[PDB]
């Protein structure tokens, strides 16, 4: 009894059926509004053998994060890969509110801190697809029925539906390594302004984290006099004990059907249908140091645009997929006339983003206006700035995509013009977004 | 006396033109900009448009060495419907006083004035921007 | 005396922030908006940080019937890069001499400064608008 | 039971088997993202027996180490020998970020200092192929069948892509000596200015640490007033809970191929093909003392150029092998101009490098400087600068290689050009690296 | 006289040349470097062009005993866009005053410009480096 | 006088710290950049270390309408080698004579040394930068 590792629980039938039950290790992990929580149902079939280590080494690991959505991520001690592939799904799923905590701007940053008191008993591995490896996972017939059925059916949109459905009831992602035992975890959220060094405040805030887990109070204080808000979870007390602890690989759910099927399926998950257009140049605005351009003629009905730009050659139109329903974050939100002594668009739904600011006055109840929308907060990423103009009332910023190396983060090019010095007071904030590739299907002959 | 000055800048920051009406200055004489010897005329604003985003910039101030203020009014008024009164503006900027006027009259919900930078505790008048919407 | 005053409005229309320091009137008093009779003291506005479209109002003026005017100076810096600074204001609305003086010295190509209002010929130096912007 | 030693473990048959599962004795460690962690599929065949030493002697050893990122395999008890063995996968696979606390100037300096409190049972060996001897380590089928097909793939970019998978899952290094029993380790880091004694910093430091685990607090103040952030790690609990204490030998998996195999493997491991060009001198610059000379002609579609150099015969041009890839550090970074003030290229990607200063105006979206790339931190060591010029404004210093006795650390004599003062503000660091000649393939015909 | 004196240094951190056009000294003298006694014409620099890397220094002081400072102007010019104007530049180191001046002003975004040395305060304008890149 | 000044800026252009000693202003005061008011405490530079590619500014003049110039020393010395002396540097902008003065001496063959911008003829001595760099 006493000296037993994951090796004597997993070469016993009971004992491993009951840590494969007792951790849901054959369930996928549903990314929805109430964070990562485990689906109810099996996703793989139930191995003969688990892959497994043995590590016993007793100590505190702190890791800190800075995408938004990502906190009850970091309170189920993912790591950062896992974190990153999870991330889309939380963001798409999250409760959005104005009053959050939260900030990104481009003077202040934000950021989570979490320190694991960590009691480990090993690592147990899942073969995926992708590798070659003949131990692959098999899907459970139940699962892969429900694929088939979903794509089976008459029209797009009833295959989205049927496949948001399947996902929410089967999860958005699959855990492939994960750490075993018991473990102590602390949690906060620190916002500080960017012109900090960052390494002492990481380092502070650590040090604080570390005392509290370690002594282990829900408010700290750190050498720096910084006040903490933590959070404590307490996942410790033998084999019958032993829970996950860490998760050090995810795998996304739809990764792991066959190819032909695989790309089809993620194709249909993409939140918007693409369209490029002709453009035509804004009429006035001879003051300004390049020219805007709107789509031109009428926008199809469905259909609708992201913002002025300063392409001459064409223009994005996009149309949501999945038709809006309650408790699901619509992919594009409405925008309404500010309140005072401004012209711009105001999101109507909270950390929606557009990515241009509007050359004229912006009407929601007339084109082009009506049909100029933002983006849900997963569709954007942060560009970069190129000013034209020689005085700050006639400076315009053209934004750029991030050059990436990996096409995953790949953002269009739409060139959103950004007026730098907005006329009047209570103007919105400025866009500095560009939207995602990856979000956008084209050609799809809907 | 040249003690004595107003500088008012109408500043259109909405997308419809407004045009400037009847300005007349009672006491003390308009000026090009930060030349207070170069005298000009009521007829280069009469009727002028501001175009929206642009400024325009009227100086006024008392005639040199006079013991007297400047004093003066205008009018913005919309083109779009017939020259309709959006504001009436009042300056006084007195010598023999000091307390300085600057007073916004008129209502049209069409149109939102917002003003600022004037002083009326004592000295000049000072440089008031006025900025200028249709909403 | 309070006709010598002057209104300085740094409004910081980018995207980071600008700090102020070194904030002193050598001559003539900071007061309050539309109040010069309620002083207030330097340290109000020192190292004061004026965030991206944020107007921050610094009024100064002469001490009543003290025939002294006003006079003062101060840095805007960069919070960011260290406190490097941004340029250096000089004002001066003198009770003697009926030149004021507004000079803005100081070297950044990290930084766009603009500014507007001011009167030299005669007069108080009136309202001087501010407008910086990082690029 | 009572004064068993390593040798009662290994006699009985059923205690032998349980050490060499619970302490991960057949499998390779990955040297990875998250440290070296073992691998889940055994490298060897299972022996009949263990090669041991008895040794009983409990006490404190200290031990520091220079690299950079090999924080975490000073966390895993590795010795100076293995930490060499193993830094150059733990570089490739780190996570880079630009606000590392360790610091590598001219001026400033970094170490980590580890103390281990041993209760030491012996040490295991394991004999390796080059050893001769006729015990030696057998290869697991299953990793044997997995290179041969990793090598039987058509294309190189197959090949590659299937040795890095088959090592990313079985491992980089084997474990061939190991010490068994208990310990507890305090591991910190420390960084000072090289103009201090670094004797009398190294001892203050260890005063420090060893008097931390001595008595067994996260912060620990030295006799020379050191504040010391302390990790602290608890394997120690009978030979049931016996565990790996201490690593003293560690082979690279692939040195355990056969030799015909081993060469091949090692080839299509290097990340860079290499090639040599002509070479043309730089119009202008008469005011220097050297010559600068740059590729002649058009570079071939898909390699690159490392910068300008004094050699009037050829230049160095590299090409990835492996295609980039999200979760894996590409081999090159692409260089962006400067904020302000100066024309000078920046890393893209952080901790990376490139070997010389541009002279001339750089611009990323057309050529040369198109094709001019930095490397990864694992490609370069430091090299001596020679200087030529008179004067400060017109010196410029030439890159050499540090000569050494070993080929494993021979670098590229490519006389990369360092302008010894750069006109204007804010100019990147001065580069002082040179390129690895283990790191660049010729004559692959690829 | 010789108390007042600046030296200019316009050192192209660039990469393309610029050229130095309408280079006039309305007071005081331009001489050789360090020897104030032996004058220059504006001529030796009228025109002329400051490659990369390359430094060109203009002394401007005073007349000897003359109870007269130095003042001057020039423009920086772009020899490779048709000769556009990139810059005004304007010097002031006065006899009677204690206050120098040092103006650089037009807009180029082409260029990026930062200087240092400059002496404002009291006694000579000092030794000023002007450092020009087109970006 | 304040006529009498001198700004030293210390360019660090190599790659090891170099550190200032001994700082003494014999004569005048030393005071922040760009106020001569502002006078400075020489505990502030001494012992300071100049990173590669700094700069460090110090700014020295005669006491206001004191009839005395300014005059000062200080060393660099290399913080690695136990601070053994690089230069040492002795700056002199007299108010009684027109002859300023500004030597460098002490011999360190593993130093490079490079300075301009002093005036001599007469004035102020000027604003004088130096590029050190270690071999
Ligand atoms: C015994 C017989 C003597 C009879 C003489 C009677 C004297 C008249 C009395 C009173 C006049 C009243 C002021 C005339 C209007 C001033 C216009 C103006 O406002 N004056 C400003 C400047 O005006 P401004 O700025 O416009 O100048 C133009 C601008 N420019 C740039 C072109 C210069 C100037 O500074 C500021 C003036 C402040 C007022 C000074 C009052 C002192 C008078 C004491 C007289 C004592 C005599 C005693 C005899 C025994
Ligand atoms: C033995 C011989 C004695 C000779 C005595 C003759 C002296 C009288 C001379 C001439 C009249 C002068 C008034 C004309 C006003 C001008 C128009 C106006 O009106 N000047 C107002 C401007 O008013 P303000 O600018 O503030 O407002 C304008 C707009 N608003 C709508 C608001 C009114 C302002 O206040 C009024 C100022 C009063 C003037 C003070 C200076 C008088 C000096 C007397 C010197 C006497 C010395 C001799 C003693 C022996
Ligand atoms: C029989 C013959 C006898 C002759 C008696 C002479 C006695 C008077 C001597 C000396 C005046 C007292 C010191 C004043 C210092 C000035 C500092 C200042 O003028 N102070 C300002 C504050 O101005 P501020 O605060 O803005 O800053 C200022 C700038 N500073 C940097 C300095 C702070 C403040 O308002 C202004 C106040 C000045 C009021 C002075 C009143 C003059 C008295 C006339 C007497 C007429 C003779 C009578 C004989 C029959
Ligand atoms: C035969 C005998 C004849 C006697 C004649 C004497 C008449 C002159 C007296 C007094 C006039 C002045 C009024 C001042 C009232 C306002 C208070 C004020 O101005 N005081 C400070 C401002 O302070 P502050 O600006 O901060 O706030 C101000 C507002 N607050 C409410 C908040 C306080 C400010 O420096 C003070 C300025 C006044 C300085 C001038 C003093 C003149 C004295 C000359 C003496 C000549 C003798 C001649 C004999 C033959
Ligand atoms: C034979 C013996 C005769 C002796 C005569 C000697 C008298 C000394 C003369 C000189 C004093 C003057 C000092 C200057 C300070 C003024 C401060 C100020 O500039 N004063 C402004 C107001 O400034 P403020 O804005 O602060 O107003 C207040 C604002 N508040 C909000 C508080 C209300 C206000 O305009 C300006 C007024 C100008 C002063 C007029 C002086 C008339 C002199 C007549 C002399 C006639 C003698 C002839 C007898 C035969
Ligand atoms: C009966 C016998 C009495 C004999 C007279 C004794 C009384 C005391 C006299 C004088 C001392 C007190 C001076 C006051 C200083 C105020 C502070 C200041 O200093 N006022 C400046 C402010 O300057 P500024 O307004 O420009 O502010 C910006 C400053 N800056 C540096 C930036 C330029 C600005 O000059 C203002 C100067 C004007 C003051 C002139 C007062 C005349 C004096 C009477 C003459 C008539 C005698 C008659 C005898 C029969
Ligand atoms: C009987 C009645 C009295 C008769 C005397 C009055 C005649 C006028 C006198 C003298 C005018 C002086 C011109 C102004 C300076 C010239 C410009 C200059 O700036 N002068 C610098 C020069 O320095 P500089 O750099 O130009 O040298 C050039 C290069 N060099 C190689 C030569 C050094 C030099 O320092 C500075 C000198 C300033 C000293 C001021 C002297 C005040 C005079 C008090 C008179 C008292 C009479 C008393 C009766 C009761
Ligand atoms: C029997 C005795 C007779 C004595 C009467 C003789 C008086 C001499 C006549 C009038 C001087 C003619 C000036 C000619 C030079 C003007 C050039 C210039 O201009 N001099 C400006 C320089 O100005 P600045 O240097 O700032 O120029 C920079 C350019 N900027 C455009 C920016 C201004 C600067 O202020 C002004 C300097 C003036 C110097 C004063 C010298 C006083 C002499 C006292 C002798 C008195 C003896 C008394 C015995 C009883
Ligand atoms: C019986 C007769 C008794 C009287 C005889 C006394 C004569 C004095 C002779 C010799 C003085 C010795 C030089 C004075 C110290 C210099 C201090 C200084 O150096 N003076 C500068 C200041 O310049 P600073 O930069 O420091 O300004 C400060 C900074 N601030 C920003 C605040 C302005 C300022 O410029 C320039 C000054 C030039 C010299 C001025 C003196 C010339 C006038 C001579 C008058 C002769 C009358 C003869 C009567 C018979
Ligand atoms: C018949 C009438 C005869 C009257 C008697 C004459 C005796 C008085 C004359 C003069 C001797 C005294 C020299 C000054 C020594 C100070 C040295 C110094 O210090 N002067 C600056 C420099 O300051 P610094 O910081 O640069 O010093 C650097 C440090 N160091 C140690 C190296 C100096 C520092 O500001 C201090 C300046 C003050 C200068 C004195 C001004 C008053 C002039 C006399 C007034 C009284 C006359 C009375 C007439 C009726
Ligand atoms: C009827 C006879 C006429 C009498 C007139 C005589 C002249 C007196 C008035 C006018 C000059 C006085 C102001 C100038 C000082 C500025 C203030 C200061 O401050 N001087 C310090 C500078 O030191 P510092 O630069 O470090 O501080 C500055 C920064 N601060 C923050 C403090 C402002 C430092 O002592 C320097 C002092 C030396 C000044 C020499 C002036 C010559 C004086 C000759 C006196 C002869 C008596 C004759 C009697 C018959
Ligand atoms: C009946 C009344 C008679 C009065 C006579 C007695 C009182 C006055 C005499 C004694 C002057 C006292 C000076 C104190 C200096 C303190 C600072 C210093 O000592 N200043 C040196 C150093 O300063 P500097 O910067 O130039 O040197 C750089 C440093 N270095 C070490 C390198 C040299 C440098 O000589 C400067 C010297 C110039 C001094 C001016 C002297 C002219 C004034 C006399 C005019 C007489 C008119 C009156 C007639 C009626």
């Given at each position: 009894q006493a000296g037993d590792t994951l090796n004597d629980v997993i070469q016993d039938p009971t004992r491993r059926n009951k840590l494969i039950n007792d951790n849901n290790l054959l369930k996928g992990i549903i990314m929805g509004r109430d964070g990562p929580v485990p689906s109810s149902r099996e996703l793989i079939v139930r191995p003969d053998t688990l892959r497994a280590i043995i590590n016993n080494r007793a100590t505190i690991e702190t890791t800190t994060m800075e995408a938004e959505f990502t906190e009850t991520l970091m309170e189920s001690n993912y790591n950062s890969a896992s974190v990153k592939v999870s991330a889309p799904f939380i963001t798409a799923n999250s409760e959005y509110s104005?009053?959050?905590?939260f900030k990104n701007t481009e003077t202040e940053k934000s950021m989570y801190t979490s320190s694991r008191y960590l009691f480990p008993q090993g690592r147990i591995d899942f073969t995926t697809?992708?590798?070659?490896?003949?131990?692959v996972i098999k899907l459970s017939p139940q699962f892969t029925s429900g694929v088939q059925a979903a794509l089976a059916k008459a029209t797009g949109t009833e295959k989205r539906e049927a496949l948001q459905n399947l996902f929410q009831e089967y999860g958005h992602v699959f855990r492939t390594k994960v750490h075993i035992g018991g473990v102590l975890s602390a949690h906060t959220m620190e916002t500080f302004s960017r012109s900090e060094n960052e390494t002492e405040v990481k380092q502070d805030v650590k040090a604080g984290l570390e005392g509290a887990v370690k002594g282990w109070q829900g408010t700290i204080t750190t050498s720096q006099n910084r006040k903490l808000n933590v959070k404590y979870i307490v996942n410790v007390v033998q084999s019958e004990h032993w829970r996950v602890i860490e998760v050090t690989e995810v795998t996304a759910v739809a990764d792991l059907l066959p190819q032909p099927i695989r790309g089809q399926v993620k194709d249909l998950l993409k939140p918007l249908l693409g369209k490029w257009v002709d453009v035509e140049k804004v009429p006035g605005?001879?003051?300004?140091?390049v020219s805007v351009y709107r789509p031109k003629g009428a926008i199809p009905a469905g259909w609708f645009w992201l913002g002025d730009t300063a392409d001459a050659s064409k223009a994005l139109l996009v149309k949501p997929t999945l038709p809006a329903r309650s408790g699901r974050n619509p992919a594009l939100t409405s925008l309404h006339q500010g309140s005072g002594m401004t012209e711009q668009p105001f999101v109507d739904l909270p950390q929606y983003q557009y990515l241009s600011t509007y050359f004229g006055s912006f009407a929601h109840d007339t084109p082009p206006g009506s049909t100029l929308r933002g983006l849900r907060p997963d569709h954007v990423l942060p560009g970069r700035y190129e000013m034209h103009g020689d005085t700050i009332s006639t400076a315009v910023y053209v934004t750029r995509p991030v050059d990436v190396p990996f096409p995953e983060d790949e953002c269009f090019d739409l060139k959103s013009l950004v007026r730098v010095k907005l006329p009047g007071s209570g103007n919105p904030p400025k866009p500095r977004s560009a939207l995602k590739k990856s979000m956008v299907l084209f050609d799809s002959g809907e | 006396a040249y003690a004595q000055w107003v500088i008012i800048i109408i500043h259109n920051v909405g997308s419809q033109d407004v045009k400037i009406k009847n300005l007349k200055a009672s006491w003390g004489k308009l000026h090009a900009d930060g030349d207070k010897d170069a005298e000009v005329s009521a007829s280069n604003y009469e009727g002028k448009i501001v175009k929206p985003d642009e400024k325009l910039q009227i100086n006024a101030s008392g005639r040199s060495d006079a013991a007297a203020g400047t004093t003066g009014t205008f009018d913005l008024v919309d083109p779009?419907?017939?020259?309709?009164?959006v504001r009436h503006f009042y300056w006084d900027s007195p010598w023999g006083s000091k307390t300085n006027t600057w007073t916004v009259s008129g209502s049209n919900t069409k149109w939102m004035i917002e003003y600022s930078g004037?002083?009326?505790?004592?000295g000049a008048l000072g440089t008031i921007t006025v900025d200028t919407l249709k909403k």
């Open positions: 104005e009053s959050s905590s697809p992708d590798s070659g490896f003949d131990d605005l001879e003051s300004l140091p | 779009a419907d017939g020259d309709k009164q004037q002083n009326l505790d004592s």
